[PDB]
Amino acid sequence: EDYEIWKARMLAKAQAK
Amino acid sequence: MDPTISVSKGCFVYKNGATRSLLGKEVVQQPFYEEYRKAWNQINDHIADLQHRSYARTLEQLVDFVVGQAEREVLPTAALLTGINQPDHLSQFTALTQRLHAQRAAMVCVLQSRDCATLKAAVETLVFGLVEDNAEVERLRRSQCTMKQLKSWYTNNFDSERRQLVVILPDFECFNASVLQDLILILSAHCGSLPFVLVLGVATAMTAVHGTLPYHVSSKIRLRVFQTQAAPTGLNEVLDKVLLSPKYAFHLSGKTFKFLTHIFLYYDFSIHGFIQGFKYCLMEHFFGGNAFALCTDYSKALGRIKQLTHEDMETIRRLPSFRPYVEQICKRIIAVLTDDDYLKKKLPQLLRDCLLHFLLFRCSLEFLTELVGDLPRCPLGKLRRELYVNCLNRAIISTPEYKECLQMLSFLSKDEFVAKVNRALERTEQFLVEEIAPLELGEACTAVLRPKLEAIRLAVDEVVKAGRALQKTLQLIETQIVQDHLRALQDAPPIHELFVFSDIATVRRNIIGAPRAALHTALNNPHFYMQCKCCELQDQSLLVGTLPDLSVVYKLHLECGRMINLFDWLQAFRSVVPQIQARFTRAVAELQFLGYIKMSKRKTDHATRLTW
Amino acid sequence: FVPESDGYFHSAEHEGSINAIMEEYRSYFPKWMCILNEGFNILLYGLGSKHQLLQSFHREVLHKQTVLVVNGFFPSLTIKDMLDSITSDILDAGISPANPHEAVDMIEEEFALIPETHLFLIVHNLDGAMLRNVKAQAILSRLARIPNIHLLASIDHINTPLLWDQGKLCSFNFSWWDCTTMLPYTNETAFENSALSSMRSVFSSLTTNSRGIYMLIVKYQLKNKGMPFRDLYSSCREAFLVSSDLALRAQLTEFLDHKLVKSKRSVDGSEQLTIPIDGALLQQFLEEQE
Amino acid sequence: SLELPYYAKFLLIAAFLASHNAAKQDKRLFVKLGPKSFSIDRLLAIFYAILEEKVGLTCNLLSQISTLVHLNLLSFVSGEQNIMEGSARLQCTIGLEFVLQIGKVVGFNVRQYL
Amino acid sequence: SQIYDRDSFNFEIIYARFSKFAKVSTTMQAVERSIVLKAFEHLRIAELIMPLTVQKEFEMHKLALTYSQIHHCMQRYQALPTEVAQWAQS
DNA sequence: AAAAGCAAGCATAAAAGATCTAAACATAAAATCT
DNA sequence: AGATTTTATGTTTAGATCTTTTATGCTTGCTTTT
């Protein structure tokens, strides 16, 4: 997993929480 | 062509004001260069101090031998059974010259094998070294430095006072035999008139000294044998006292540790090559940015956190251990992944966590290594370095060898078991008092570790004052020392990547040199390097027609026998793909230039392969 | 690369790809400057020619530092030439002493006298045609030991580290770098280290009597499928092609100079005169002379 | 009492087998007067035959060959001027008992191949 | 030299021929190979043995003596043990 | 019958042995500084 | 009118050369065991 798409998906999981 | 490519000259000066710190000020004023230079100066000075403290006993014995000859025909002479690692011993002989000059007991010449191809050159460099060494303590041409001039110079100077004339011969094995025997007979002829002492540097054994010195030459020899310590003992001393010291914030990973010791034990016993490889590891670690300049002692680390910019924040976010730290945590992770200042305020807790974990790792290792390596068969090894590599490379409790250690420690009688655990407790407490108390962040480390040691000592008192309690003592030792303070490197606290160095591939590439592997994978599959869209081979023996021209000739070469006629080789290459004959001649000339083939001399238009 | 011993006991798109490879190796350069600053020396061990890469390093990065380029692929360079070049041009110290290790001792003293006067030393093909002896590698290792002198070097031969023992390999504080360009070995093989038409071209320049002497050797070779010297001497004195023996020896010395004739002496003392060309082409040459 | 690196020990016992076993017996021992001359490629072939581990041909291994030559553990009976061209001939110059001691420390039983 | 008709010898051949006597000599059992090697070098530096002009233990050599000189040494020698005097005859 | 083994043969080459020559070293003529 | 590099010159020794001679080795041509 690339760092950029992982950081973006984790920010999406935070903002969707 | 290029102006550098000349038919006449071979060397091309580009002088820019040379008469009779390469980097600019941007790099030297960067913090990562400062922390790298600081850690390297500390590590290099500690290793030099260890080497001097190991050599000092043999140094005092050699200086006492020279002064004892000075208190007083055969020339006195001192064989020094030094190790295979010849370059390292020049510092030893230099320390011997420093001691002999500081006592004013002797003057020293050093006879390298490169300077003494003949007896004339040996006598000239010997007399020139003695006279210029005396001149350097407080220039004749080398054509006129006769031994008679050495006698006249010694009578003009030191006859009124006796300085010894020590003649170090550091590379005894490299000498011509006849020149060395004639030189020993010459120095033996001048004994009484000139006080000579002949220390030697025998890398092999005394049988070489008894072999190269004949009956006539050994009739005039009164040699005494000194022994330098073994190279693996010096490696173990450096690895335990320097690379495993608590006080350095930079640690190698277990793979890099095993790789550098593998180069030492399996290839060359030079300490200097191991030191340069550790220096390359330190440089490859610290040149990744100012985020790796955080890897230092705790106060300068807090100053580095308050110095930081934004690319350093990005490269402390990108490192792999941060991702479990984020997913094991919403507004806090928005402030961590975006706000930057919150990560600047939260860095000191993570840095103190990592430094405290590595201090507890070293203390729990200083506990466990005695208790494990005293055992017969040693499942985890004797010294601290093997248990360091084992506990870092993988989780220790899940290994079969830890089960073997628990079984063989369970089989002990009560007296040796209680004596072993008490020896581990006394050794760990002595280490906590001696080495962790002066260190910064060592008070908190002692505060974490010491009640656990008191609980293990209470379990020892419980098994003393009362069979099955030994299993409870093993459980206390496992879950307060091995489980908590000896985690695998993947289970280290987050942003431990700033402190360990685990990138073994690029450093193994840049230290271990394998030209033949690069030439092999370049002459077999060019697609590995060129990355063409057409030149890929599904297997390495295919020989496709779109290959670069050296590869086709190399494969038609590889697929046959030793002696190779050029003509059917040319027909096969012409069948694969005028200018084609010139391309074949260019490929055969390049393949000869690499040494893979050679032209035959006895048989025209043929070639023999030098490879097998 | 883990070779098996049984082989001894039984004995377009390419331009863009090469340009991307060269741009990556050009991107490596600041790391090489820091590595050279730390005391390591650079060694390149790729497949193709690395002349243009080290020339680009000298051109783009070392544009103002003192630099001694050394062409190791030169057939006729000597280590005395390189030590004389350093001693005379870098330090203005005159000619180096005739013992090369004395010259390295002198260079070490004079470079100890001048800190922050670094001398870069670029050696294309450290395994060069005249650097393959152990002594020149010992001189190069003693020069690379100096803190002032930094060294970049290329390696091409497969058997190069057979001459580096651990002392030289410790003096050569190498940082190995796989710079595998795919460029052809033009300049490295352009030098001297790596026929009926020529016979006609030299036969045209000869005089009539030399043509008769060579035609006599050609007729004897085609008739007998090397002639003794006495038969050629009697045939030339019968055909009036020579005045005495010594002029015939001068003509055969000219033929040996122009390689038309090989002279193979016999155990009996007679001189044999082989023509080193196959008899079909020799028969065609005799038909050309008619 | 001559401490050695591990691969230097295998190189030294391989040079002893190359100088002690003659050229013809390698085909029967490894496919699976005085000391004999041996070329360096014969030494590498016997070393890879007795190694049973197959390390790569790095710079350090041929450097171990040259530094065994420099310690007078091996010798240059000929060649010298052309070590790289394959015309060089080496000659092992140690006794059998040191080879048996090295084979005790290593665990390679030398006497099977003699 | 008498057996092989003045062929060149070697330290190994001469040490083997000496040890075949030394195993039954009952006075020469105690010598080391190194003492015999230093004795061979002591013979070489007196030019009683000359090189044919390779390890020092394997270099080929020539005797520099007629057999009559060694035979007169056998009679002129002082305190010669009888075992050596019997071995010299055969 | 397959592949290791002994005389044969020219050939690079290696010693050598004289021999000639180029560069390093000792030395004298001389402008130069005092 | 005297000291100092400076330069031009001669000698000497190490290296290039010519030549003979000798040898191991590269290849050949049978030769012979498995």
Residue numbers in the entry:
A (entry chain F): 223 to 239
B (entry chain C): 1 to 20, 38 to 89, 94 to 159, 177 to 199, 202 to 369, 372 to 508, 562 to 672, 687 to 721
C (entry chain B): 276 to 286, 323 to 505, 515 to 545, 552 to 616
D (entry chain E): 318 to 349, 375 to 456
E (entry chain D): 358 to 410, 420 to 456
Q: Mind quoting what the paper says about this structure?
A:
The loading of ring-shaped, replicative helicases onto DNA constitutes a key event during the initiation of chromosomal DNA replication.
In the DNA-bound initiator·co-loader complex, DmORC and DmCdc6 form a two-tiered hexameric ring, with each layer comprising the Orc1–5/Cdc6 AAA+ ATPase and WH domains, respectively. In DmORC·DNA·Cdc6, the co-loader occupies the position between Orc1 and Orc2 and engages in canonical and non-canonical AAA+/AAA+ interactions with Orc1 and Orc2, respectively, to close the ORC ring. The N-terminus of Orc3, part of which folds into a β-strand that abuts the central β-sheet of the Orc2 AAA+ core, is sandwiched in between the Orc2 and Cdc6 AAA+ domains, sealing the ATPase ring and forming a tripartite interface. Two conserved Cdc6 arginines positioned in a helix that typically harbors the arginine finger in AAA+ ATPases—a residue involved in stimulating ATP hydrolysis of the adjacent protomer—contribute to the interaction network, indicating that this region in Cdc6 has been co-opted to mediate protein-protein interactions at the non-catalytic Orc2/Cdc6 site.
